[PDB]
Amino acid sequence: VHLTPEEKSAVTALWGKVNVDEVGGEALGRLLVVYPWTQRFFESFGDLSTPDAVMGNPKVKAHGKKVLGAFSDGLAHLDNLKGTFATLSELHCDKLHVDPENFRLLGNVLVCVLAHHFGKEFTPPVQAAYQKVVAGVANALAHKYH
Amino acid sequence: VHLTPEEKSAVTALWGKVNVDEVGGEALGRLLVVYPWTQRFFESFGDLSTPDAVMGNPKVKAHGKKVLGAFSDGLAHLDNLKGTFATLSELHCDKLHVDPENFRLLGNVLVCVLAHHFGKEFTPPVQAAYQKVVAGVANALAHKYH
Amino acid sequence: VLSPADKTNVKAAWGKVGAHAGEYGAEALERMFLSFPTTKTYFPHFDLSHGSAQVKGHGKKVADALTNAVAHVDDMPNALSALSDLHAHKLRVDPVNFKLLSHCLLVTLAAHLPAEFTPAVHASLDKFLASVSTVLTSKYR
Amino acid sequence: VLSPADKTNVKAAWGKVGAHAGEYGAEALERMFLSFPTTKTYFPHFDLSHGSAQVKGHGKKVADALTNAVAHVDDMPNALSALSDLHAHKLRVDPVNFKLLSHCLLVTLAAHLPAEFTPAVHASLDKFLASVSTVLTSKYR
Ligand code: HEM
Numbered sequence: 301v302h303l304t305p306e307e308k309s310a311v312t313a314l315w316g317k318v319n320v321d322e323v324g325g326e327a328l329g330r331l332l333v334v335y336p337w338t339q340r341f342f343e344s345f346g347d348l349s350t351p352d353a354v355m356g357n358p359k360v361k362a363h364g365k366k367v368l369g370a371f372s373d374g375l376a377h378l379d380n381l382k383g384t385f386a387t388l389s390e391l392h393c394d395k396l397h398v399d400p401e402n403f404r405l406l407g408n409v410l411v412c413v414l415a416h417h418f419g420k421e422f423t424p425p426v427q428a429a430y431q432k433v434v435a436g437v438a439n440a441l442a443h444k445y446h
Numbered sequence: 447v448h449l450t451p452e453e454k455s456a457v458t459a460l461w462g463k464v465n466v467d468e469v470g471g472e473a474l475g476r477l478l479v480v481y482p483w484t485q486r487f488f489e490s491f492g493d494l495s496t497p498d499a500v501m502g503n504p505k506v507k508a509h510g511k512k513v514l515g516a517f518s519d520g521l522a523h524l525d526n527l528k529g530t531f532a533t534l535s536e537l538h539c540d541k542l543h544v545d546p547e548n549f550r551l552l553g554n555v556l557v558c559v560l561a562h563h564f565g566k567e568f569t570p571p572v573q574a575a576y577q578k579v580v581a582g583v584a585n586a587l588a589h590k591y592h
Numbered sequence: 593v594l595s596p597a598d599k600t601n602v603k604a605a606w607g608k609v610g611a612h613a614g615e616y617g618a619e620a621l622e623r624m625f626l627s628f629p630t631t632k633t634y635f636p637h638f639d640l641s642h643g644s645a646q647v648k649g650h651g652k653k654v655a656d657a658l659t660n661a662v663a664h665v666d667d668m669p670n671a672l673s674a675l676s677d678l679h680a681h682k683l684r685v686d687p688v689n690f691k692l693l694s695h696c697l698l699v700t701l702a703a704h705l706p707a708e709f710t711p712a713v714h715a716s717l718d719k720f721l722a723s724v725s726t727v728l729t730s731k732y733r
Numbered sequence: 734v735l736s737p738a739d740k741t742n743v744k745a746a747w748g749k750v751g752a753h754a755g756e757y758g759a760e761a762l763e764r765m766f767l768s769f770p771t772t773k774t775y776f777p778h779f780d781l782s783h784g785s786a787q788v789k790g791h792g793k794k795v796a797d798a799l800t801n802a803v804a805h806v807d808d809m810p811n812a813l814s815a816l817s818d819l820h821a822h823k824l825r826v827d828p829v830n831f832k833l834l835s836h837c838l839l840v841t842l843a844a845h846l847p848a849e850f851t852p853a854v855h856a857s858l859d860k861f862l863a864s865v866s867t868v869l870t871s872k873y874r
Pocket residue numbers: 338341342344366367370371388392396398402403404406407437438441
């Protein structure tokens with residue numbers, strides 16, 4: 301992913317302020333509420349029957365934190381996203397059979413969450429830089445399908 | 447794209463019987479009729495206002511023959527689709543900005559056309575082999591985005 | 593969103609299937625399982641061998657649901673509510689699978705009814721299958 | 734397909750936008766043009782510089798169409814027929830672009846109305862925008 305130096309600076313500064321205990325769980329929770337077929341992949345999490353049950357589920361919170369960690373790994377390796385996500389791509393494709401469109405959906409839900417947390421600070425140029433990042437992550441996760 | 451020896455034989459035998467003057471034009475024509483926003487990329491073709499105008503349009507027929515030629519080239523280079531179509535992918539992705547979902551749609555319309563022409567001979571195992579082919583071609587056309 | 597001509601085109605094409613509806617349904621499923629093997633994950637409990645009675649039986653149910661959808665084309669959320677409960681609430685079928693089955697049904701119709709499978713009819717059937725798919729994958733209760 | 738709760742959630746959330754409707758519409762377009770530059774191809778005739786009066790004017794038209802869609806949520810194909818003709822027949826907008834604008838509107842609402850943007854409301858608005866998108870990209874005449 302190519303970011304301009306101004307984009308790289310704005311992306312890094314915002315990311316450093318991300319609440320690590322909330323943002324990931326909220327992005328995953330919203331994926332499960334907004335796109336309910338994604339719940340099929342998380343039957344071991346128990347109760348996901350209502351938005352309140354999803355958002356307060358500790359497995360959603362913990363898994364969401366792992367998902368946030370992987371996006372963070374992407375930001376540390378923007379020049380080698382395919383290589384960084386190789387093992388994750390094999391897991392999601394070959395084992396879980398997650399349709400790649402769902403990767404794009406999660407990336408965009410994460411962008412909605414960053415907007416929700418940062419408000420006016422999540423400006424249209426800041427969003428544009430984050431869209432390049434999440435598209436690169438979704439593409440890297442879908443690489444083993446390609 | 448990996449085809450079994452039985453798949454390679456059945457794919458080659460059917461492909462050898464394809465009417466080179468019709469099949470490509472019919473696949474492109476059906477893309478334009480079934481998914482009408484694709485017409486935006488072909489404004490130089492003139493009248494595309496009705497299914498009969500699309501199907502009898504000589505620019506649709508000639509361009510469809512070029513599209514069929516590229517799928518024919520894909521079948522000859524299943525082990526190197528990305529390299530074979532590198533220039534074609536630069537045209538569609540960098541110059542035309544065709545959304546990649548449209549490449550999948552054309553591949554599937556081509557499968558519908560092959561079924562239309564071959565009838566009972568286009569058996570479910572024959573279709574399965576052709577689906578591997580068209581997914582690979584669509585993936586190679588979208589590679590310059592990746 | 594279906595036009596009045598789309599509804600007529602679907603009724604004409606689906607009417608020509610008539611009594612062989614179950615056969616077309618079974619073939620579309622077989623095509624789906626062979627072409628897109630990930631779809632088999634929704635049917636671990638099925639015998640999926642060629643000519644399996646279970647696939648034939650299921651094919652008839654799918655085809656009969658489509659006949660019912662055609663008959664209630666303007667009232668599909670109400671008429672297909674039980675099937676939405678099953679696919680959207682219980683099974684949580686990823687919508688991509690409906691695009692795969694829809695494509696395999698179009699292939700089956702193109703192979704067996706070539707005179708009926710005109711570009712206009714292909715367009716109307718594709719729209720009809722997408723509308724039925726939206727209803728079956730949405731939670732609207 | 735929208736549930737009764739979705740319609741209530743959309744009416745409440747879109748009602749909270751109130752006088753700022755046009756501002757949110759303009760910001761969603763700006764976010765779309767910057768995040769997904771391919772979308773600019775549909776607007777060669779627009780001044781797309783930041784704070785352009787044309788983008789502000791268009792933003793108000795988009796937002797007002799959405800208000801009209803909410804006001805006729807159970808009769809959208811009939812109420813939006815003119816917009817459908819424009820986007821599907823005349824402009825031939827690729828449906829992917831509707832997903833992009835819909836996402837940018839959700840981002841704008843998440844940034845400016847955080848108290849309203851609950852997971853349940855986010856789900857209802859996403860379904861509403863997808864239903865409006867299907868109507869605007871279909872030829873039903
Ligand atoms: C594009 C964004 C995504 C990222 C970065 C991502 C990242 C991750 C990570 C880091 C793990 C943990 C792997 C481990 O422990 O070794 C994981 C597991 C998993 N992911 Fe994803 N994922 C993404 C999208 C998805 C989507 C869209 C789905 C399903 C709809 C999904 C379903 C799963 C499942 C089912 C597991 C296994 C969880 C378990 O152990 O029960 N992921 N993902």
